[PDB]
Design a protein around this ligand. Structure first.
Ligand code: TXE
Ligand code: MG
Ligand code: MG
Ligand code: MG
Ligand code: MG
Lengths: 494, 494, 494, 494
């Protein structure tokens, strides 16, 4: 069941979280946080900047010192702590989901069922890895005993976006902590509030001070202080390709910190004429429209084989007209607002470009309401590869439908992008399913489905969609630093 | 046995290698290659620059296309080809070792036994991995069949230094090819010649054209074209920390290419009073003086416990006086020249700083001879942490000896550097061996030995000594890109 | 803190557990269960035999059918269930520990702290593996896509002993269930009661009917019905070497079921003259005397280097005189009874053989009290290799101390047994620690400690001490059956 | 190209091979070895029995001692030796293929291309694993450093059949030697000769004496001495299910040696109405008729969906009539003899049972020729589940074709056997491919192909088709024994 959301939320956690204590910003500045459905201020939060980040990094470094409680505790106890944290998220699920919906413009039933469910599941999966991260014993040449230690990397700076604020917060801290790292988290300026609530739960669960620090504030201030910091070992970032470039450059200029990036996409969804059409229409539809289009994996180039194209367009348009826009806390609302004015204007501008460049506007194409950042769900057909709406990540409720005839051509077109996050293929042909998935330059390839993301699966981009993977076995190994130890012995035996 | 070296070598491979053919530079320019022991010109080599790199990257890209011979080939056949390459190195061992000694200022016996032995071993280890790089099947939530592919990354730019030219060439191409990548290699301008001879063996072994391309030339021209190229998927670099910063920055500013770096060090070697002194003196001595000090892992901060410090200094000084400097092809010579004038002047300047800053000059401390870049083997004692010779990588035959009293202090001092490549510990105490090795922020930690490097071990730096690991199981996972494929099914079963 | 135990326990779960329901035996027979400290009857339990086992195996088979709730549920949900079961064990910890102490003759504080703690920890570790058991994707020759599935093996018969009844019950069901198997458990006739209580918790936690079935009763009846059953896929057994032989033969004669055995030992503990003696005395002492000697790993051959032998004997004898025998529920009692009359007589007979064969009786050597199976802690010195007490597993509070002079000789003597479960080495010498541990033919080798067993470590025997490993990563892989699936495709790419 | 076979082979290796020397049998007895196509004696070979096995096991044990050349050798050197062995097989390919064809009744082109090709590939794959078999470092609870060693198991007895004599020899020794074991091999009495030639190549390649020992002779004499030996650590066996039962029983009764078995099959091949029929007919046909039906994986229950059954039968019968029987060295012959009289009579008897039990004889059904054990290729249709030819492994050129209507029923029928080695599915449906392959209780499941076996894949049976897997990563883990070493330390850090 989905309970009724709370209303009249009273805010409590508005400060910078360092060493399990709440701090005012060093400057004393605060910044306002808004509800994108109503444009009203929810509260004000302490504005972290470089001086706040430096305090947080000193805390994280101290907590990582050899002999500290976090370095010496059993790996199994790191697991127990993560599970305790998941129990507290379950206890606080209704508050968190309400908060996430209010601050994120996110449909409440989705926040409650999907986001919060994924948050719990992600932590449970992470908890289970803690005492199963292992090194090796290695049959090296000569009279030596050699082993490796899978150590934590150290102090990990973690910068996250506004589209799945709580889920992304846990995607970052879960694996990092499971592996024994300490962290400095920088939530999006738009969406700090669930992250700050999580500070109280981290303390309550019993994590040692300085293992998680949380610095709300802006990007080129707090975020950039993290990327350039000379005592941050690793930075992990989810957001725009443009900012990912700045982060990698900053890492280079400063201390060569390790870098992982998940960056967004222009993911192709390929529907062959032999596909189950009912299934493909719905998955491709949800695949681009989910959370008002504000998903890195959005199926924002829908390639449909010529013989089924007109029918696929007709059904896709029909499907896009079935939404009720409004406050995402209101029962019956099936589409909320975009996050803020910047994203709103970016989308409208891209919609305008589609009209100007000759795409066929099938429905929507304009704003809705007299408050909040609402945009009518929009479908364009007869989209061609050179159009802005075919090239640029829109991050709004805007679907592009394109035709193809040749298998070789559609693979080429699908791969002809600097992005590489995900892709979908719809076919009943075994050979196409395997060979087309092998040929697509995308990190995750769905076959006869879309948007299926689990904690057990590694997730991340090819090309400019990202560096590294998150979650799964592979993700974890990347919050470790490998040390080889080679001991001379009188005589080795096999 | 070590055969007599060749003399009066006739050079043959002096051109840019692309698509298994030999090309003049686009500009027509050539650059001279010298013998550092004699200062005489060995030959001229085509000067590759940006336009040559662009041809090479186009060739590597074409060779990496889906359906190409290199992509479709059995993994086991990639392994066979690598072993065939090692057989050809075996056949050409005397030529390659002679050429390496002449061009690199490297003691011929060492080039023949160690460098070329390591080249062969590295390739044999790589060849064995080719058909053992596997993905996973994953028991993800819901009715899906999910698996991963460990795909090659793609086109890999590989930039290498002058100290172990051939060995570094094969450390790069071996793992990359084992995993199915295609490569563009940029040898150091000082030492292109053994790499160019390898082009002929790569063609002879039967690698498809475009799988290995080799562009000799300079750093800020050919190297920088690779690091900034918009169609190179990954850059791997071994060299100076200064250039590694440029490489990472260039990767960020361009196409977000994956980056691995191995960058040199200021490696501490810690000798406790309970150590076997005979063993420790020799390992520490070789650990800093090997190849005229031109090793990334040089034991360039030797920390010796107070009660044994004077005796260790005395023994280390005695040991450093047993060298015959000269041409490294000449029987009886046990120390060759530094690679070139830049390095020579850098070393002399650091020696001068030691004298100025109050270190105790125990022996050497000046140049030798009237041709070639020779420096007397030099030992400083009473070295303190703030001295230039205690902080900066010297890369010359210059040993620093420092005293300590406290275990906690020597760990702190050992770790108090931006570097983290390697370290050594000498002790008879089991507890110190394990706990001190855990506490040291170094990628490889040797216990009662030093300089022990084998293809089976991962190798690389903590902190600003590097990103990523090379060789071993962990290294090979670095030349792959993980794809997750998730297929909808009617019902899953365990 | 250790709470006071319960007294006046009222028994509830006395029946055969099949399909989450409680059954009377098919014959109607019951068997008595006793307290070994008092010889009083605790209760009667339904006596399972072949006809009961057949019902249980049919239940387990049905629960394992393709499409069943247990085969289709998410692997992550198997994990959640195991953790829920651990939560219930925590809730019921005082009852279970009291029961275990009363039925097992086991010191209550140990039952509460060690056994029950290990039970919880084992389940938490198992839970975390459930959705991390993965297969492979394999770069096979030719145009094929090949993967493997790590399936459960199926119906697993699990026969367990009386010395750690609850812990062994969870060692068996934890990994089996984590991997997706169904099970038929046969607790020791001496000690069914905690296992039956666990049936109620299994039901309460929500495991589907037939996933765990529990058949109390005797060995050659219920146990042998399991080992010979034509529809049991795998049998796992912990107990005597003699019975392990019967189980493996039965598996051969019947349906070739998979077999794993942990079988007991005659584990050597080697103390070199360079060891920390205080540490070695206590670990070797606890290593043989723990739980009245009733541990598979008992350090029942203590080899002490000649120069420290007399002192080690003196201190070991002194240590063995510090026990208070009695009811293991009574505060202050530090040694409980042996499990039953058979074991009691076996021990006394072996003690008698040590006296007859010329070992030096240092202390104990006889029974104590006028009810319950109590034996004075006994130390023999001047033990030689041919003596019964040096060869045969005693499984009582009887320590054998033996001298050695030569390193080569002591390794030979240590290895000169058909057993191979565990061993200990006490030394301050790094080289001995590594090389002696490599040379000993034992499954687990402790260095400067003994009896250290964790869920993260694989555990089992060399030679006649066992087949396979339990727990750790390696243990789990053995509750799986590997299926290779190879699909023809038009063209493979790397 | 296939060269002409040799004729008039002169035999040289006819003795028992122990410690790299050739021994007469202890008894002095010899046994004759025949050509099954001509019934003529090729040569006589020393008849090994229990006393010969005992000499061989003593040699293998000595070679496995700590400090021996085989135990102390670098793992990478074991790999080099294996590759050298494969080089010698390459050199001796024509001799070995000719000898295999003559002794084994095997088509010469197949022996030269397939058997010998597979022999070489297997060894090359094995050689690559040698220095990549690794243990773990484990983050166990408490202040300990814990690691594991993946040790060899020890002395491995290896008993092999007559159908793929050389290939099975190398399937056994390759993985065992790669992992560092020593072996005692017992070739089938029908086919010792290629194995004895391998002894000469093992010595030539440079394997230390006692690492491979080879004892020709009979089963209940030499084989049973191995299975019951008190100093063989592991037995690996390929052959009849009946003998595998004896082997497992003997292991239980003696020393609890580890056991792996591959035992033959009654493998179902399921053709759905939506399959590519041309493809399915040929794969199913080869899948049962290959090597005169003498393959463990024979597709000996062909289930064809009702609507296509008559056409499939017609096409299968047409296909079975295209053979020329005769001497397998003769160009143009496409079917050779069965191995010996026992097999010949067993096949004829099963053919007779098919006729008696009402199966429809479509073609063949009787003997051919006046010398050698030839049977006409035989096809039965309208075969039902209860018939002897539907249940028992025939191991002759006899194809059974059965109809089905329901998916659920054909899975149930396919699984309704004690066997479980392999299966095939032919369909164009993605869902059926994945779900039906998940549901089939078979070790290898082929989709749209059959008989595809590669060194990179694990291979073995479910149920009474086997215990354990051979080859692939999983197989190699089967020739190791895991040791856990746990060292006390002052304080652990992550
Ligand atoms: N590929 C496959 O799986 C198959 C291959 C061959 C037949 N397969 C099946 O088995 C049947 C009989 O063939 P046989 O020839 O009798 O096999 P055996 O199993 O006897 O012979 C196999 C090996 O075991 C040795 N041996 C025999 N008796 C022994 C004993 N008591 N202790 C120890 N060892 C004994 C024997 O010397 C030979 O070395 C065939 O019709 C096939 O159905 C399947
Ligand atoms: Mg921005
Ligand atoms: Mg430079
Ligand atoms: Mg018994
Ligand atoms: Mg037989």
């Amino acid at each position: 069941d989905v309970p009724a959301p709370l209303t009249n939320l009273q805010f409590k956690y508005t400060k910078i979280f360092i060493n399990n204590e709440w701090h005012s910003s060093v400057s004393g500045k605060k910044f306002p946080v808004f509800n994108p459905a109503t444009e009203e201020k929810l509260c004000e939060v302490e504005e972290g900047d470089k001086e706040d980040v430096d305090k947080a990094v000193k805390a994280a470094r101290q907590a990582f010192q050899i002999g500290s409680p976090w370095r010496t505790m059993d790996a199994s106890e790191r697991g127990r702590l993560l599970n305790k944290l998941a129990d507290l998220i379950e206890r606080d699920r209704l508050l968190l989901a309400t908060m996430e919906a209010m601050n994120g413009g996110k449909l409440f039933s989705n926040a409650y069922l999907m986001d919060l469910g994924g948050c719990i599941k992600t932590l449970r999966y992470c908890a289970g890895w803690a005492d199963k991260i292992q090194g090796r014993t290695i049959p090296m040449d000569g009279n030596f005993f050699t082993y490796t230690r899978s150590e934590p990397v150290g102090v990990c700076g973690q910068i996250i976006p506004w589209n799945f604020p709580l889920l992304m917060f846990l995607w970052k801290i879960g694996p990092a902590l499971s592996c024994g790292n300490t962290v400095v988290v920088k939530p999006a300026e738009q969406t700090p509030l669930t992250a700050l609530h999580m500070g109280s739960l981290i303390k309550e669960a019993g994590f040692p001070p300085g293992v998680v620090n949380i610095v709300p504030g802006y990007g080129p201030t707090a975020g950039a202080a993290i990327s350039s910091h000379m005592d941050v070992d690793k930075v992990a970032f989810t957001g725009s390709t443009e900012v990912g470039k700045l982060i990698k450059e900053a890492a280079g200029k400063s201390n060569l910190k390790r870098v992982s990036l998940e960056l967004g996409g222009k993911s192709p969804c390929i529907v062959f004429a032999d596909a189950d059409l009912d299934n493909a229409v719905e998955f491709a539809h949800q695949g681009v429209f989910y959370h008002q289009g504000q998903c890195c994996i959005a199926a924002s180039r829908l390639f449909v084989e010529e013989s089924i194209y007109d029918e696929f367009v007709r059904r896709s348009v029909e499907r896009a007209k079935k939404y009720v826009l409004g406050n995402p806390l209101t029962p019956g609302v099936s589409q909320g607002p975009q996050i803020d004015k910047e994203q709103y204007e970016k989308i409208l501008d891209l919609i305008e470009s589609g009209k100007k460049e000759g795409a066929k506007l099938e429905c929507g194409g304009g704003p809705w309401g007299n408050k909040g950042y609402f945009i009518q769900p929009t479908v364009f057909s007869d989209v061609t590869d050179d159009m802005r709406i075919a090239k640029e990540e829109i991050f709004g409720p805007v679907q592009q439908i394109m035709k193809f005839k040749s298998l070789d051509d559609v693979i080429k077109r699908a791969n002809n992008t600097f992005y590489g996050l995900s892709a979908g293929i719809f076919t009943n042909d075994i050979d196409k399913a395997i060979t087309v998935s092998s040929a697509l330059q995308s990190g995750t390839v769905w076959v006869n489905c879309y948007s299926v993301v689990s904690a057990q699966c590694p997730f991340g981009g090819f090309k400019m969609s990202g560096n590294g993977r998150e979650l799964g076995e592979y993700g974890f190994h990347e919050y470790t630093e490998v040390k080889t130890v080679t001991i001379k012995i009188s005589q080795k035996n096999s």
